[PDB]
């Protein structure tokens, strides 16, 4: 009966839409930061998170969202999701300052799974960052 | 001491413990309530994992405290 | 041994440890530098995440090594 979830995350996203409370990122973070979570809500949840805080941002959010990216093992099953992870983690930034540069460095700090595909996508498109 | 334990979803649990109670003990009360085994638990508070052996007094965990229950998992 | 610790946020801390230093020992040195509780310190290297216990000589961490430190969610 996997479907009621979509109805939940949906409502919430519209619930604290315009409020920026504390219970939001309070439970949302873990859902996609705790330690390895079903890509069912993990991705979705994350999306909503950025959806609201799409404007402003913070480090805690990133440092966390990152912790998950690592706890994301293809142990679950085969499915396309790089579309979401990229999107969020993407819009998540917009400023300037070798910011995204450091991020990519992390993805490399660890192993080197299929994520490599992303290393190119982002690594390619980005502001000037030569010498 | 009446403490609350919020699950990584919504459902909450009210455990009647004390300040001299050990985390491990709490996890036990949770296993008897729900059915999840200790080895498969992880209490988090203020964004920090609560090591076992310690007591609810070390973390100053007072009453009506909402402990963030989670399920730890290995990695690589 | 002089090693550098690059934090995801944006900073580079330099510590004077030794190949015979245990990860836990390093985390402690950092806590004294800034104030980030050990438990809340994820160190990563060319390999992966360093566990609490082993030494810097196990991961072959030489000098001038940049360890990617990440904060495990806020922590009161």
UniProtKB/Swiss-Prot annotation, chain A:
PC repeats lie at residues 7-41, 42-82, 85-117. Transmembrane segments: none annotated. Signal peptide: none annotated. Acts as a regulatory subunit of the 26S proteasome which is involved in the ATP-dependent degradation of ubiquitinated proteins. Belongs to the proteasome subunit S2 family. Present with 306000 molecules/cell in log phase SD medium. This is 26S proteasome regulatory subunit RPN1. It comes from Saccharomyces cerevisiae (strain ATCC 204508 / S288c).
From Swiss-Prot, chains B, C:
Phosphorylated at Ser-65 by PINK1 during mitophagy. Phosphorylated ubiquitin specifically binds and activates parkin (PRKN), triggering mitophagy. Phosphorylation does not affect E1-mediated E2 charging of ubiquitin but affects discharging of E2 enzymes to form polyubiquitin chains. It also affects deubiquitination by deubiquitinase enzymes such as USP30. Mono-ADP-ribosylated at the C-terminus by PARP9, a component of the PPAR9-DTX3L complex. ADP-ribosylation requires processing by E1 and E2 enzymes and prevents ubiquitin conjugation to substrates such as histones. Changing residue 65 to G: Phosphomimetic mutant that can recruit PRKN to mitochondria. Residues 1-76 form the Ubiquitin-like domain. The record marks 68 as: Essential for function. The modification (Microbial infection) ADP-ribosylthreonine is found at residue 66. There is a cross-link at residues 6, 11, 27, 29, 33, 48, 63 (Glycyl lysine isopeptide (Lys-Gly) (interchain with G-Cter in ubiquitin)). The modification Phosphoserine is found at residue 65. The record marks 54, 72 as: Interacts with activating enzyme. It is found in: Cytoplasm; Nucleus. The modification ADP-ribosylglycine is found at residue 76. There is a cross-link at residue 76 (Glycyl lysine isopeptide (Gly-Lys) (interchain with K-? in acceptor proteins)). Exists either covalently attached to another protein, or free (unanchored). When covalently bound, it is conjugated to target proteins via an isopeptide bond either as a monomer (monoubiquitin), a polymer linked via different Lys residues of the ubiquitin (polyubiquitin chains) or a linear polymer linked via the initiator Met of the ubiquitin (linear polyubiquitin chains). This is Ubiquitin. It comes from Homo sapiens (Human). The gene is UBA52. The chain holds residues 1 to 76 of 128 of the full protein.
């Amino acid at each position: 009966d996997t479907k009621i979830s979509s109805a939940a995350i949906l409502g919430l996203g519209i619930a604290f839409a315009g409020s920026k409370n504390d219970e939001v990122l309070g439970l949302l973070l873990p859902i996609a930061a705790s330690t390895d979570l079903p890509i069912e809500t993990a991705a979705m949840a994350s999306l909503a998170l950025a959806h609201v805080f799409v404007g402003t941002c913070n480090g805690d959010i990133t440092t966390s969202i990152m912790d998950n990216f690592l706890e994301r093992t293809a142990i679950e099953l085969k499915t396309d999701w790089v579309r979401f992870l990229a999107l969020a983690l993407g819009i998540l930034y917009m400023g300037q300052g070798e910011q995204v540069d450091d991020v990519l460095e992390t993805i490399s700090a660890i192993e080197h799974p299929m994520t490599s595909a992303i290393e190119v996508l982002v690594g390619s498109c980005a502001y000037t960052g030569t010498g | 001491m009446q403490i609350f334990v919020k699950t990584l979803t919504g459902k909450t649990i009210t455990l009647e413990v004390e300040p001299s109670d050990t985390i491990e003990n709490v996890k036990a009360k949770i296993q008897d309530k729900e059915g999840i085994p200790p080895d498969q638990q992880r209490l988090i508070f203020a964004g920090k994992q609560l090591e076992d052996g310690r007591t609810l007094s070390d973390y100053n965990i007072q009453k009506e405290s909402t402990l963030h229950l989670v399920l730890r998992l290995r990695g690589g």
